[PDB]
Scaffold this active site. Structure first.
Site, PDB file in Angstrom:
ATOM      1  N   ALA A 282       0.841  -1.201   0.000  1.00  0.00           N
ATOM      2  CA  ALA A 282       0.000   0.000   0.000  1.00  0.00           C
ATOM      3  C   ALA A 282       0.877   1.253   0.000  1.00  0.00           C
ATOM      4  O   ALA A 282       1.489   1.592   1.015  1.00  0.00           O
ATOM      5  CB  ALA A 282      -0.904   0.006   1.233  1.00  0.00           C
ATOM      6  N   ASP A 283       0.953   1.916  -1.156  1.00  0.00           N
ATOM      7  CA  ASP A 283       1.794   3.105  -1.300  1.00  0.00           C
ATOM      8  C   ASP A 283       1.238   4.288  -0.515  1.00  0.00           C
ATOM      9  O   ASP A 283       0.206   4.173   0.135  1.00  0.00           O
ATOM     10  CB  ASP A 283       1.923   3.474  -2.785  1.00  0.00           C
ATOM     11  CG  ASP A 283       0.583   3.936  -3.383  1.00  0.00           C
ATOM     12  OD1 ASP A 283      -0.415   3.936  -2.676  1.00  0.00           O
ATOM     13  OD2 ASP A 283       0.579   4.284  -4.552  1.00  0.00           O
ATOM     14  N   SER A 284       1.967   5.407  -0.547  1.00  0.00           N
ATOM     15  CA  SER A 284       1.583   6.604   0.208  1.00  0.00           C
ATOM     16  C   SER A 284       0.121   6.976  -0.013  1.00  0.00           C
ATOM     17  O   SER A 284      -0.571   7.330   0.945  1.00  0.00           O
ATOM     18  CB  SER A 284       2.467   7.780  -0.199  1.00  0.00           C
ATOM     19  OG  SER A 284       2.300   8.038  -1.586  1.00  0.00           O
TER      20      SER A 284
ATOM     21  N   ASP B  42      -2.315   4.952  -0.856  1.00  0.00           N
ATOM     22  CA  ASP B  42      -3.074   3.910  -0.172  1.00  0.00           C
ATOM     23  C   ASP B  42      -3.052   4.154   1.336  1.00  0.00           C
ATOM     24  O   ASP B  42      -4.066   3.988   2.015  1.00  0.00           O
ATOM     25  CB  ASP B  42      -2.451   2.533  -0.458  1.00  0.00           C
ATOM     26  CG  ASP B  42      -2.660   2.101  -1.918  1.00  0.00           C
ATOM     27  OD1 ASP B  42      -3.461   2.713  -2.607  1.00  0.00           O
ATOM     28  OD2 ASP B  42      -2.008   1.154  -2.324  1.00  0.00           O
ATOM     29  N   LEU B  43      -1.879   4.529   1.845  1.00  0.00           N
ATOM     30  CA  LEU B  43      -1.694   4.777   3.271  1.00  0.00           C
ATOM     31  C   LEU B  43      -2.558   5.932   3.757  1.00  0.00           C
ATOM     32  O   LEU B  43      -3.131   5.859   4.846  1.00  0.00           O
ATOM     33  CB  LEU B  43      -0.221   5.102   3.548  1.00  0.00           C
ATOM     34  CG  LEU B  43       0.654   3.860   3.319  1.00  0.00           C
ATOM     35  CD1 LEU B  43       2.130   4.270   3.333  1.00  0.00           C
ATOM     36  CD2 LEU B  43       0.417   2.833   4.432  1.00  0.00           C
TER      37      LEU B  43
END
Length: 81
Positions: free
Chosen positions: A38-40, A42-43
């Protein structure tokens, strides 16, 4: 009433439903971006979901201090008081 179970279970609900992943990938030491992918972006959405769910606001600095699910869980437990 507040409980660790409530944090972890609810946290998994957002991450799992949006990523289609079971808590097995979720760990107090697992990174949401590396361990789950989960990329930024997603975060931000995941933490945000908790931001409204728990009726609490998060610090951009807190985000940097939060990398693994352990930090997510511990953050909510302490943030709520």
């Amino acid at each position: 009433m507040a409980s660790r179970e409530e944090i972890f279970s609810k946290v998994k609900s957002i991450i799992s439903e949006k990523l289609g992943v079971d808590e097995s990938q979720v760990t107090e030491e697992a990174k949401l971006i590396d361990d789950l992918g989960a990329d930024s972006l997603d975060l931000v959405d995941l933490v945000m979901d908790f931001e409204s769910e728990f009726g609490v606001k998060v610090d951009d600095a807190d985000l940097e201090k939060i990398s693994t699910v352990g930090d997510i869980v511990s953050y909510i437990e302490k943030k709520l008081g």
